[PDB]
């Protein structure tokens with residue numbers, strides 16, 4: 017139904033590759049430039065590879081990478097919208113990361129919060145919210161991507177440095193655990209793509225997170241923004257803010273929260 021013929025595609029350029037299979041740029045019906053999330057020959061079972069595409073079928077928002085089409089047999093493809101600027105993580109680390117200041121970074125955060133607020137309304141969980149799974153387009157447009165672990169509320173593993181403790185420990189994945197991940201994402205944005213918890217290996221991470229350790233306010237980051245991070249990192253998942261709140265907060269940030277912001281050397 018979302019199905020198309022392999023005829024219609026043509027995989028041109030190989031952009032990355034991620035161990036569950038491959039990702040190419042390409043065209044579709046000749047007319048349209050697309051991205052094609054493929055699979056090298058039988059990696060992970062074809063139908064658990066199917067269900068990222070079904071998650072993407074039910075979801076549609078301007079701040080989510082739009083599904084275009086699917087090819088449900090072999091070799092499988094997942095045809096999606098193409099984002100010219102690649103992953104947010106590489107963008108922050110790369111050449112353009114120098115020039116990004118807090119107003120640009122907060123606006124990127126606002127967009128991501130907007131996309132997740134939609135996920136919130138639709139009663140889904142992403143379970144893998146991080147800068148590496150955000151895609152940038154033209155005009156600094158940011159969209160949430162990679163719904164391989166996304167599921168309706170009622171495989172592989174999970175990066176502990178981005179995962180809420182209750183989810184990493186007891187498998188309790190909610191929209192509130194995604195809120196935790198968003199808070200971690202905010203540190204990625206404000207540190208130009210640096211790995212969270214510097215010098216801390218994976219379960220030094222959780223054991224400290226369980227003693228109540230939280231990442232400190234990044235250099236040149238306003239404390240009001242670090243306060244927002246800390247709210248996203250509250251031990252009780254239910255004390256955590258909504259993405260609806262986060263979106264409005266970030267959209268209005270430089271008028272309501274930091275009206276006297278002045279540019280620094282990095283932020």
Ligand SMILES: Nc1ncnc2c1ncn2[C@@H]1O[C@H](COP(=O)(O)[C@H](F)P(=O)(O)OP(=O)(O)O)[C@@H](O)[C@H]1O
Pocket residue numbers: 031032033034035036037039051081096097098099100101102103151162164
């Ligand atoms: N819609 C799009 N427009 C433009 N570029 C896109 C794009 N989608 C992906 N890329 C690009 O494909 C690369 C390799 O896949 P990745 O490193 O992302 C990982 F594998 P991915 O998480 O996709 O694989 P998997 O974990 O198996 O789902 C990434 O660097 C990403 O920028």
Ligand SMILES: [Mg+2]
Pocket residue numbers: 148149162
């Ligand atoms: Mg990815």
